[PDB]
């Protein structure tokens, strides 16, 4: 009788909390763990068709090993009118004109993501399949760029925090500007401390927002201390996650009967 999550100080976390009051689910835990051992521990399960909840979301490579279902949401705790966003420290845009319109213009889906996090999960490297997709997705890349100048070797941060889909957004881009002259270091932290480095200017660029609720709470505590520039996705689904062979149990308030 648990769930199994992912990093504490995640904005998805702190809204299975409120999840669990809002449905009333209050002899059950939420294990806070990392990315790595969230999964680790859906392949345990879902090939020994056991019972488990997990704190999914979509856009996410899990979704095409297995076959899995979100639990409707009444009461939406969560929130559902999601997006993933492109965020930088104030005055970036006028610094760097160039960067900040290589930024602006991003924007791709769930799918085509997914086609790089599915190879990461193979066991690849997130630069050299970024090369790839680079090279094949060839006019995307194109617009992505399109009026943005090759740079010579200015420095840019991308800070992220390493949720499955920021390692596949963060590196193609990661790429996409390398691809350009620009010299890239690709800061692994925290969701907070993330935004915090943008806030405060520790940092570039920060493709690794959902919003207007998942990270809501930093968004506030952080008002006019940052530039909103892109809307990398629309329409991104997240909530309590059990494999679909639990037809029993097909929503929140029933996972509890």
């Known amino acids: 009788k648990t769930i199994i999550g992912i990093d504490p100080g995640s904005g998805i976390m702190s809204l299975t909390d409120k999840a669990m009051k809002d449905y009333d689910l209050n002899d059950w835990t939420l294990i806070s763990a990392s990315s790595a051992a969230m999964t680790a521990t859906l392949k345990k399960s879902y090939d020994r068709k056991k019972p488990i909840i997990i704190t999914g979301w979509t856009p996410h490579w899990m979704f095409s090993r297995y076959k899995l279902k979100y639990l409707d949401d009444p009461k939406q705790s969560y929130g559902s009118a999601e997006e993933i966003h492109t965020i930088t420290r104030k005055g970036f845009s006028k610094e760097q004109p160039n960067a900040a319109k290589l930024l602006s213009q991003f924007k791709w889906t769930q799918d085509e993501m997914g086609e790089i996090m599915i190879k990461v999960e193979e066991g690849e490297k997130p630069a050299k399949v970024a090369a ?8 995307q890349i194109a617009e992505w760029t399109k009026g943005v100048q090759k740079v010579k070797g200015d420095k840019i941060n991308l800070a992220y925090v390493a949720w499955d889909s920021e390692i596949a957004s963060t ?16 800061t692994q932290v925290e969701a907070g ?4 480095a943008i806030a405060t200017g520790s940092a570039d660029a920060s493709l690794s927002a959902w919003l207007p609720n998942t990270h809501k709470a930093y968004a506030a505590k952080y008002k006019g201390k940052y530039d909103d ?16 062979y639990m ?11």
């Open 132 to 139: 790839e997709y680079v090279n094949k997705h060839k006019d």
């Open 171 to 186: 590196n193609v881009i990661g790429k996409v500007l390398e691809d350009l002259g620009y010299e890239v270091t690709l």
């Open 193 to 196: 401390p993330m935004w915090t």
């Open 229 to 244: 520039i892109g809307t990398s996705m629309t329409g991104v689904k997240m909530g309590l996650v059990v494999p679909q």
């Open 247 to 257: 037809k029993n149990v097909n929503s929140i308030e029933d996972l509890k009967k």
